[PDB]
Motif scaffolding. Sequence first.
Motif, PDB file in Angstrom:
ATOM      1  N   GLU A 109       0.805  -1.187   0.000  1.00 16.87           N
ATOM      2  CA  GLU A 109       0.000   0.000   0.000  1.00 16.87           C
ATOM      3  C   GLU A 109       0.851   1.254   0.000  1.00 16.87           C
ATOM      4  O   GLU A 109       0.658   2.148  -0.834  1.00 16.87           O
ATOM      5  CB  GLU A 109      -0.942   0.005   1.177  1.00 16.87           C
ATOM      6  N   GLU A 110       1.842   1.307   0.881  1.00 18.20           N
ATOM      7  CA  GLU A 110       2.663   2.475   0.925  1.00 18.20           C
ATOM      8  C   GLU A 110       3.516   2.667  -0.353  1.00 18.20           C
ATOM      9  O   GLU A 110       3.699   3.803  -0.830  1.00 18.20           O
ATOM     10  CB  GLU A 110       3.459   2.638   2.248  1.00 18.20           C
ATOM     11  N   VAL A 111       4.036   1.582  -0.893  1.00 19.57           N
ATOM     12  CA  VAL A 111       4.848   1.678  -2.102  1.00 19.57           C
ATOM     13  C   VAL A 111       4.017   2.284  -3.208  1.00 19.57           C
ATOM     14  O   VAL A 111       4.424   3.259  -3.823  1.00 19.57           O
ATOM     15  CB  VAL A 111       5.436   0.323  -2.531  1.00 19.57           C
ATOM     16  N   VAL A 112       2.809   1.761  -3.396  1.00 27.58           N
ATOM     17  CA  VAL A 112       1.924   2.219  -4.457  1.00 27.58           C
ATOM     18  C   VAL A 112       1.532   3.688  -4.299  1.00 27.58           C
ATOM     19  O   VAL A 112       1.614   4.486  -5.271  1.00 27.58           O
ATOM     20  CB  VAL A 112       0.680   1.278  -4.552  1.00 27.58           C
ATOM     21  N   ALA A 113       1.100   4.061  -3.091  1.00 30.22           N
ATOM     22  CA  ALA A 113       0.746   5.456  -2.805  1.00 30.22           C
ATOM     23  C   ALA A 113       1.909   6.422  -3.035  1.00 30.22           C
ATOM     24  O   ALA A 113       1.699   7.508  -3.562  1.00 30.22           O
ATOM     25  CB  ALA A 113       0.231   5.619  -1.377  1.00 30.22           C
TER      26      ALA A 113
ATOM     27  N   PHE B  81       0.787  13.117   9.364  1.00 31.78           N
ATOM     28  CA  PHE B  81      -0.315  12.243   9.826  1.00 31.78           C
ATOM     29  C   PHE B  81       0.211  10.866  10.185  1.00 31.78           C
ATOM     30  O   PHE B  81       1.099  10.351   9.536  1.00 31.78           O
ATOM     31  CB  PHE B  81      -1.384  12.081   8.744  1.00 31.78           C
ATOM     32  N   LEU B  82      -0.338  10.271  11.230  1.00 30.06           N
ATOM     33  CA  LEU B  82      -0.051   8.887  11.546  1.00 30.06           C
ATOM     34  C   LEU B  82      -1.261   8.194  11.037  1.00 30.06           C
ATOM     35  O   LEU B  82      -2.368   8.519  11.464  1.00 30.06           O
ATOM     36  CB  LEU B  82       0.107   8.698  13.051  1.00 30.06           C
ATOM     37  N   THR B  83      -1.078   7.266  10.099  1.00 28.68           N
ATOM     38  CA  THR B  83      -2.208   6.690   9.386  1.00 28.68           C
ATOM     39  C   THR B  83      -2.082   5.178   9.177  1.00 28.68           C
ATOM     40  O   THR B  83      -0.980   4.652   9.076  1.00 28.68           O
ATOM     41  CB  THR B  83      -2.449   7.413   8.015  1.00 28.68           C
ATOM     42  N   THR B 104       2.901   5.560   7.932  1.00 23.44           N
ATOM     43  CA  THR B 104       1.932   4.497   8.167  1.00 23.44           C
ATOM     44  C   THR B 104       2.212   3.737   9.467  1.00 23.44           C
ATOM     45  O   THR B 104       3.349   3.532   9.854  1.00 23.44           O
ATOM     46  CB  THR B 104       1.886   3.526   6.981  1.00 23.44           C
ATOM     47  N   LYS B 105       1.160   3.332  10.157  1.00 17.16           N
ATOM     48  CA  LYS B 105       1.288   2.437  11.301  1.00 17.16           C
ATOM     49  C   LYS B 105       1.576   1.026  10.827  1.00 17.16           C
ATOM     50  O   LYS B 105       1.030   0.614   9.805  1.00 17.16           O
ATOM     51  CB  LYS B 105      -0.001   2.455  12.097  1.00 17.16           C
ATOM     52  N   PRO B 106       2.454   0.274  11.529  1.00 17.43           N
ATOM     53  CA  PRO B 106       3.325   0.643  12.673  1.00 17.43           C
ATOM     54  C   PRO B 106       4.561   1.419  12.236  1.00 17.43           C
ATOM     55  O   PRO B 106       5.310   0.932  11.394  1.00 17.43           O
ATOM     56  CB  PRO B 106       3.750  -0.726  13.229  1.00 17.43           C
TER      57      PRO B 106
END
Lengths: 221, 224
Positions: A109-113, B81-83, B104-106
């Motif tokens: 998810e983070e890579v894509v975003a 933001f912590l998301t 992102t969490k964690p």
Amino acid sequence: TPEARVLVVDDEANIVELLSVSLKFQGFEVYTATNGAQALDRARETRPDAVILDVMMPGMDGFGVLRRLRADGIDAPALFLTARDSLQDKIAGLTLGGDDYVTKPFSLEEVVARLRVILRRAGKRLTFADIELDEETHEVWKAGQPVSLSPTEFTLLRYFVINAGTVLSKPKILDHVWRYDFGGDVNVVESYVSYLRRKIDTGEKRLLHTLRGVGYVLREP
Amino acid sequence: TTPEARVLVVDDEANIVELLSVSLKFQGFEVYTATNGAQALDRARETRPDAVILDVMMPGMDGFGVLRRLRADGIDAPALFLTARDSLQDKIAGLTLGGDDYVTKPFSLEEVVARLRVILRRAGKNVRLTFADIELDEETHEVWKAGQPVSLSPTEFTLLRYFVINAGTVLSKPKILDHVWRYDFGGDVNVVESYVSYLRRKIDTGEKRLLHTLRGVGYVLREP
């Protein structure tokens, strides 16, 4: 068209596999390389819109590989995969220009975003009579008023605007609007022209005309 | 401005408020805290933060709503933001508008600190000084003497900057001592003599003497 061409550079094969399968399933065209030499070759062959590279690599780290690419005129933005222990030391290289990073252990998810954001940052209104269109968002306006169009009606409206004054036969419209995928009855073209007239051709003067037996044409009379 | 920045941390999870403020304070940030949106708006007006860190997941009103309201009150600090990761594709526009960013969490503390420094730099919207053949950059601390880089200690730099900005003014050891060490130091004035001496040996070399001693009175940076 793919959303973008992405080149993944990492010497860890299972991470190359994971990244490319994910990206492909999200609709990206993915190419891969396990080292700097393979990276420079693939970037010239495939001209990527973005590069994902691991900072930790055998021999030559991910910054060096990126310097070399950039010296060859490949200016695509980069997303680094990076360890957390090296963040305060490496922050300048990791975020220069329109580059960004994710820290290990990372999520897809983070890579894509973070990829979509760098692609948007790196990217640098048709009118006819009282009709306006935005090719980017697909919003349509009629005498200032928002009009809601399905994807097909939009394509159809754009095709008429871009070819204003040209008589467009049902077969030409059918090939263009459904990209050669569809080959059934032309009266689907008649239905769509009818829906489209009902939504955008509602003023004093008729803009969308039928030349019977021949085709349709958009002309401001 | 004593601290690297004033940061306001907004989260309803107390152990995370604790963790974040202890780390940030240990990095030299002045930290202020809130457990909800009402306390956030109050602390932001009292303390005028340079950055806000807020959890997106909060009771009653989520972190975007709290930010909207801070921003309507004229508080324009950037936000980290912590998301959660599950909500990334849906929330990406809110999470990266302007000069905001997210973790992102964690999450790691390294990452929070790094992303915070980047937003702070992006939000702070060059500076040069010259005298005869001496040049200084106030930003980087580089010094040049007839085009040649000169390596100065932080003190030597402060001292040379003090002379250049006050070129032509006779500066006494006590005035120099007060400014160079920010009133923290009150011991022997011969430390000023030592530093002027180090400084003369690095930037004041041969030909026309630029740095002078008016004996019994003080020092002056002037053309002979």
